[PDB]
Amino acid sequence: TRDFKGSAIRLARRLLPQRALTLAVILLGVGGIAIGVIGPRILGHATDLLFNGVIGRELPAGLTKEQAVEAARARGDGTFADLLSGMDIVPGQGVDFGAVGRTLALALGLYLVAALLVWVQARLLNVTVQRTMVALRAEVQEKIHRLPLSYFDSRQRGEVLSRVTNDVDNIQNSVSMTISQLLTSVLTVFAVLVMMLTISPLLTLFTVVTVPASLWVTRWITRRSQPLFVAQWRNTGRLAAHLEETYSGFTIVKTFGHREAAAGKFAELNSETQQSSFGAQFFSGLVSPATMFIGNLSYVAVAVVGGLQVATGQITLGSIQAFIQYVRQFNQPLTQVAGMYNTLQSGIASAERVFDLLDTEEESADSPRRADVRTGRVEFEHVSFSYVPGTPVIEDLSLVAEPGSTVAIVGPTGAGKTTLVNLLMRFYDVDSGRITIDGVDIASVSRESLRASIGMVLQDTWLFAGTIYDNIAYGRPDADEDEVIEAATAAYVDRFVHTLPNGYDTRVDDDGGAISAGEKQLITIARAVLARPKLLVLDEATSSVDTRTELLIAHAMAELRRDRTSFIIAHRLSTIRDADLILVMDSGRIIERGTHEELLARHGRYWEMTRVHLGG
């Protein structure tokens, strides 16, 4: 299904590339960890000096250590002598505070050095994390610009947006909150294990016994919690899909009386998401207490056995103090990792989704050749295309467009008129055949240059969040004010813009604004006109615009229609009258073609379509 271990490996490899700066980060971390781990041994030596002085002060000065042990054995209870045997005290001396002070000064210097090294390592980690995050966002943007249209068509917009924006932010947050902890914990475990091996093998065995038991309990808990996490993400996706469908079509949901059904569906999906989230959170959070419990069991065992050994004289009190410090500093990294396991798990899931998006197949290898329309002649040669292979939509289609000719495309509602100009713009790849502009194949040229050469009025009008001026200048952002104003006036955008109190400054949007459907279409027309295209495609450009306004629009656009090989798709036959070439296509095939006079004389489909106005 989904690869989380591989995604975690890929994320780690992106965060820690070849040994240029990651080597410096690792070395600084190792040095700081080792220097700060040495410290408890020094503190234990100071404690040993204090204990030795305090114990030896109370014994008579005339006796040696062996004589003191013998005297203690001659006394009662036997065990004080065994305790004294390992002390290495000098009776009647007391505490030498000079040695204590020197030892503590050494410890303080080492601690300062360790703090400085840790600070530098943290700064380098921040730099490298931000580098990988910038690279990740840039790669996501490039992938968005490289994907085929069927990828966006087959998915919901909100799901893709969350995979593109939310998942990257989640990766950033998880990495910035866990990477330094991870590195420090991994280094600290081995450094502390080394020092505990130095102090005493038996107690370090007792301490390292935790790792098998902790890993086993972690495996059990993670086996019980991974299905819960999968269910939580599935339910979250279902809830987000329902919310997106309800919000996007809120007018249809609201007006058609389906508001209560949407509310009930949301309630059930919200309850499912809550139950799955609670289960996943509880089981994921169970990891830290279990690790702490096993570490505390080992701590109790170490404390008891160490106290027994010190009372017997096998280990000194300062050594046991250092070992207790090391047991705490060994258990802390495991507990920290267990506590941040949930953040790591969320980040790894987000990385899995992002890498899934980044591994999607792209359109094709875009040719580096720049498009150059010398005259504007467009020709189709047996072009066949089909979405969802097995259902042909265009087959064995051919046409010739003269460099100045206005080609009109008319026909039934699902004939393939939009598909034809989408193939011309190379929005989709032709299954069989080829399309040539001025003798050069459009499949052997860069998509960017080809699409910039052709100025298209989309059938589905779209505007971005911004001013009317910005939307019109979207066609050619480098144009000056006079050109934008002229393009708006020619498309009669200026006529309704002057009415508004914020002419050219009023903000419009795809789903709203101070605009109407006809005015939105007019703005799209002006946007396409400002691009001064060499090839013009108007795919139902006046469907939402009244005939009185469209006549003036045609009068103004006669300048552009003269020498730019206009492709006109229109269900209003008056708008495509007197066109140089009229194509009538019915089921993806051009069943009849010619000018208005020849098509009328030939009768056929075009004559029937024109006679619909006259009735019968």
Binding site: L43, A107, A115, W119, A122, H145, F250, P412, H571
Partner: protein, 575 residues
């Protein structure tokens, strides 16, 4: 600025305050148990080791074992109840946001947009829930550990607890200074994250327009600059965050060295025992490690604050369209439209878009509304649906004001195909069920046949179960129009509102659909917004609006002789 965050927390954690109290009690018990284990170790050193009493060592080890069992029990209880409280808070906040958004009108919903509403119904709520969860789990440990460690130090050796009483405020002050310098950087980083997300959303929503105009280099440059700015802010935040661990550890270590020095000074005299050094070292290593743990996840606070600002912005929006006190409920509303002296002005506009509009649509008749682009036909259609409320006058459907009705029966009597429509993701049958929700396959096929949509649905191998994309973009524009028409038809409503529902149909398909609707909607009132004069001849009444007011009312023959605007339209459309 975090005023809205606290209001949201206070409102939506109130049902779980008892769970929070239980979590706090269990957390303090577990933290004091973990702090008490070093105290028992100190007792082992002082009582057992210093006196050679191994039996006392074994007894205190048993005490330590019991303390560890209590600690693990309390930690498990704390994580369970914290998960319960956090997930309940998130569930309740999501429900509240969704319920408030579903009461919005068109204007209030458009003030935010569907994408923004979805994001702040899911991810903003998730961010605030994560804040609650991490506060319950890890953030409260640091104050509890600090206070409990101070009290444990007082219990162990009151003559050396001043070292903790000095070390804790010093680290607190240093961390407070770092946080004061770091929080505005985090807020700026969140602002830039919102900006880059807006750029990405704009790019994804208009990907077809981007590729049509070859705007790839411009979008790439815009994203590169936004990415660089966000990276600079994140680098500054990381610069400030990289000081928190070294300062905390330096305080730990300086406090440990001073502890050894001053404890040795006190142990040289008969004022302190050796095991208190072990106890205090563990107290430092626990208190400031808890502080270090709590300080690492501090990015979640400004993010939660801005997300709460957005959520409270949505939740503070007041709806303008409601059932007033007690809606009138006519039996089987199936009649006429009044529209008496209706005047409408869009909110935030300087001039009204409709002025003194007065015309009556008789029941069972077809009324055609004609006009220029931006005349106000869609506004009038939305006023009939009561998607917007008239500034002045009234609409008076069935002789009763649309404001006096509850908007469920008014919408059940109206089958609307809007100018800007929507087809949901799923199947054709599922989309058609929005019209009826209990329709059989036979009446589904009848509705498809009326809309001339039966051919391309039957042609699919899956028939009525042919998949439909999120907006129907796997269909042609006229196929989407015919699906919307079929959805309106399957409802069999009393009133048909065709807000330019035939602009994407060819002449033959338009004629077939219009004849089928004439056969079907003969008994139902029809209000049609059309541009072709040839199709308004069949209409019983034609309304012409220009500049936002009615310029002529009558039939086609009457209007071509008395209405200059209608005459101009007919002359323009003449063949």
């Amino acid at each position: 600025q975090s005023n809205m965050l606290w209001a949201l927390l206070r409102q939506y954690v109130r049902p779980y305050r008892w769970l929070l109290a239980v979590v706090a009690v269990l957390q303090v018990i577990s933290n004091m148990a973990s702090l008490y284990l070093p105290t028992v170790n100190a007792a082992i050193i002082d009582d057992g080791v210093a006196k050679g009493d191994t039996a006392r060592i074994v007894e205190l080890g048993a005490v330590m074992l019991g303390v560890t069992a209590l600690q693990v029990v309390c930690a498990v209880g704390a994580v369970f109840f914290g998960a319960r409280a956090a997930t309940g808070f998130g569930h309740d906040l999501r429900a509240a946001v969704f319920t408030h958004v579903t009461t919005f009108s068109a204007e209030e919903a458009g003030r935010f947009g569907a994408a923004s509403l979805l994001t702040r119904t899911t991810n903003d709520v998730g961010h605030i829930q994560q804040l609650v969860q991490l506060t319950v789990t890890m953030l409260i440990t640091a104050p509890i550990m600090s206070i409990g460690g101070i009290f444990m130090a007082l219990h162990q050796d009151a003559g050396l607890s001043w070292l903790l009483l000095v070390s804790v405020p010093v680290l607190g002050l240093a961390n407070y200074w770092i946080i004061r310098h770091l929080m505005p950087v985090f807020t700026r980083m969140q602002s830039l994250i919102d900006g880059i997300n807006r750029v990405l959303r704009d790019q994804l929503s208009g990907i077809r327009v981007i590729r049509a105009f070859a705007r790839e280099p411009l979008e790439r440059v815009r994203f590169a600059e936004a990415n660089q700015t966000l990276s600079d802010s994140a680098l500054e935040a990381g610069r400030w965050q990289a000081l928190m661990l070294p300062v905390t550890t330096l305080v730990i270590n300086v406090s440990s060295v001073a502890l050894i020095w001053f404890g040795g000074l006190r142990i040289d005299a008969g004022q302190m025992q050796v095991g208190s050094l072990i106890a205090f070292l563990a107290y430092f290593m626990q208190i400031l490690m808890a502080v270090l743990m709590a300080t690492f996840m501090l990015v979640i606070f400004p993010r939660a604050a801005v997300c709460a600002d957005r959520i409270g912005e949505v939740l503070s929006t007041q709806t303008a369209i409601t059932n007033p006190a007690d809606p009138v409920r006519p039996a089987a509303i199936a009649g006429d439209i009044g529209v008496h002296d209706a005047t409408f002005c869009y909110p935030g506009a300087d001039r009204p878009v409709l002025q003194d509009v007065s015309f009556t649509v008789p029941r069972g008749t077809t009324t055609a509304v004609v006009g220029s682009t931006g005349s106000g036909k869609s506004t009038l259609i939305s006023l009939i649906c009561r998607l917007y409320d008239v500034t002045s006058g009234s609409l008076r459907i069935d002789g009763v004001d649309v404001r006096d009705l509850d908007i469920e029966q008014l919408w059940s009597a109206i089958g609307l195909v809007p100018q800007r429509g929507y087809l949901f993701s799923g199947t054709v049958a599922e989309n058609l069920r929005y019209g009826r929700a209990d329709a059989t396959d036979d009446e589904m096929w009848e509705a498809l046949r009326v809309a001339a949509a039966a051919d391309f649905v039957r042609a699919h191998p899956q028939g009525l179960d042919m998949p439909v994309a999120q907006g129907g973009i796997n269909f042609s524009g006229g196929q989407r129009q015919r699906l919307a028409i079929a959805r309106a038809v399957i409802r069999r409503p009393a009133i048909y509102l065709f807000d330019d529902a035939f602009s994407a149909l060819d002449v033959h398909t338009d004629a077939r659909v219009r004849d089928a609707l004439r056969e079907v909607a003969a008994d139902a009132t029809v209000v049609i917004v059309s541009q072709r004069i040839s199709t308004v001849i069949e209409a019983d009444q034609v309304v012409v609006i220009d500049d936002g007011r009615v310029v002529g009312i009558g039939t086609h023959d009457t209007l071509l002789a008395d209405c200059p605007i209608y005459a101009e339209f007919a002359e323009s459309q003449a063949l």
